């Protein structure tokens, strides 16, 4: 589902790199999705904390962004959150 | 107020760069804020389309993110949407 909506995970600028095969196949139905989605920024937060750009390329006009979300070290589940996020970051490199 | 919640607008990666004086002062009460919020990604889109990373720094552990949202030149308001977004991108450079 994740592959169908956004594409295959890869190293190129036109591709995302987040998600193991379980998250890729299940998507929002993934058991641990709410725990990941809590770090996804709201609309106001996204436009408030990110570096935004307007880039016109041969592929078209794009609204670009870059940023970083600080994880609360005083959160009781801080260690599990890191493991789960690292569990999906660049997991496609380990795909068979 | 955008500045109180998400800091001053600036040229650093640590800093957000989006928002003119009106949007900073009014925030979500800005007249055309919904026209901007529509381009913010959903939780699934954010983690599905963005290139995600993790960094452990002296300031803490950070979930880094970057991506590109294609704007539809087909939308009837495409020109107005581009103008609106460009109005707030890097507007801080012209601040008193």
């Amino acid at each position: 589902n994740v592959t169908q909506a956004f594409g295959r995970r890869g190293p190129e600028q036109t591709q995302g790199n987040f998600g193991d095969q379980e998250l890729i196949r299940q998507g929002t139905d993934y058991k641990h999705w709410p725990q990941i989605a809590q770090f996804a920024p709201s609309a106001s937060a996204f436009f408030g904390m990110s570096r935004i750009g307007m880039e016109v390329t041969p592929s078209g006009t794009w609204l670009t962004y870059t940023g970083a979300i600080k994880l609360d070290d005083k959160d009781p589940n801080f260690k599990d959150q890191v493991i789960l996020l690292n569990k999906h970051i660049d997991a496609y490199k380990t795909f068979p | 107020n955008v500045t109180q919640a998400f800091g001053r607008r600036g040229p650093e990666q640590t800093q957000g760069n989006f928002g003119d004086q009106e949007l900073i002062r009014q925030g979500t009460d800005y007249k055309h804020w919904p026209q901007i919020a529509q381009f913010a990604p959903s939780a699934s889109a954010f983690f599905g389309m963005s290139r995600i990373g993790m960094e452990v720094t002296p300031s803490g552990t950070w979930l880094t993110y970057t991506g590109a949202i294609k704007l539809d030149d087909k939308d009837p308001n495409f020109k107005d949407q581009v103008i609106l977004l460009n109005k707030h991108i890097d507007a801080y450079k012209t601040f008193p």
Partner: nanobody
Amino acid sequence: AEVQLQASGGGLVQAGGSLRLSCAASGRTDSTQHMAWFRQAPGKEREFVTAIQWRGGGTSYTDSVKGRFTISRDNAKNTVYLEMNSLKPEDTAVYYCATNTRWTYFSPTVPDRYDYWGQGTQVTVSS
């Protein structure tokens, strides 16, 4: 001249052979946003080959090299590698690595958008 680029890895190989170009960045590498490789064949214009984001690591390629060329960088060191497999006579050219400082998501593909340049490395594919 805040950033210095050191390029190497050129050589002479037969069609189907392999080479690895390297571009090591020194100085204020913190301002680097994109690193790219350009090439110029005899009597032809400078052509974009590949590029990589200095922070996130997203990669870009021109159509003629997709699948055969792979650009990479381990995030901790400031040296980027371009692995060139299945080399063709059309790849014979002088290769140049370059860096820039303006943040963009997509790596620029025109030389004027890059600020720092390395020495040219000659690549020749000979029958």
